[PDB]
Amino acid sequence: RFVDDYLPALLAQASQLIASEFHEVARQHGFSVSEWAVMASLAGSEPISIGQLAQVTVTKQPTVTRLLDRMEARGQVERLPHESDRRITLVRITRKGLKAVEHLMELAREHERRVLEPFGLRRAEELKQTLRQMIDLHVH
Amino acid sequence: RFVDDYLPALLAQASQLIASEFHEVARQHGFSVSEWAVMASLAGSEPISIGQLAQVTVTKQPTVTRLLDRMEARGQVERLPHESDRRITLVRITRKGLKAVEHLMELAREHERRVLEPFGLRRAEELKQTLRQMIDLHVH
């Protein structure tokens, strides 16, 4: 059976199943999936470009721009000029956004800990290191 | 930075980046992403339910049903009654579909081998085993 060990299918199924579990929690706390992805991606971060945010949230750039229009209207994020290049808009989470998502982030950590507990610390760390290395090799 | 080591974000980014690389090849061979996902998921498989196909292709069931309507019209797949329960439709790839996707599947194997080569056989096998175990623990 081709798909049983095919890496892209394994990554896609694992990603969807784990993410869907936490998205239920996010929505019961009043967050859309994309709002949660943006705020979690910006929390504890220096300002990053719209393109970087689109990559780390796995969201198309025009979609991200529309999302930021409304999240900025609500005071949860702020767009800023890049200090040097003007073709570049940076974005950051505001204090309002951070306080809004703080509790959800703790719940997200608890859920991740539950997901990784059966694998043990060594296998969990190996998985995260491999995923990080793969991202850094394949990002454009 | 919360998102740098957050498992769902790592899985989602790795999945998207690797998949996007191969989707380019699929489209240059005349396949849509969803057509490729269905045919690759059915290749070498016994007939599976529409729900199982939706899970393994990470596609909503109504979307899968519409896709199968047109792929069955083109003779690439076939829907069948389940032998016992009638609330269940099974689906299989036809010989026409298998021959259509054979070369693409070889290219997919070559691409996966390229993606996994820098990690070595041990780390690649560890990744695939962990992903498989996670899927089997979280599928419903």
Numbering used by the authors:
A (entry chain A), B (entry chain A): 10 to 149
Which passages does the manuscript contain on this structure?
We characterize the binding of IAA to MarR-family regulators from both iac and iad loci. Most characterized MarR-family regulators function as repressors by binding to an operator sequence upstream of the genes they control. When a relevant ligand binds the MarR repressor, it releases from DNA, allowing gene expression. The structures of MarRs from representatives of each auxin degradation operon type establish that each has distinct IAA-binding pockets.
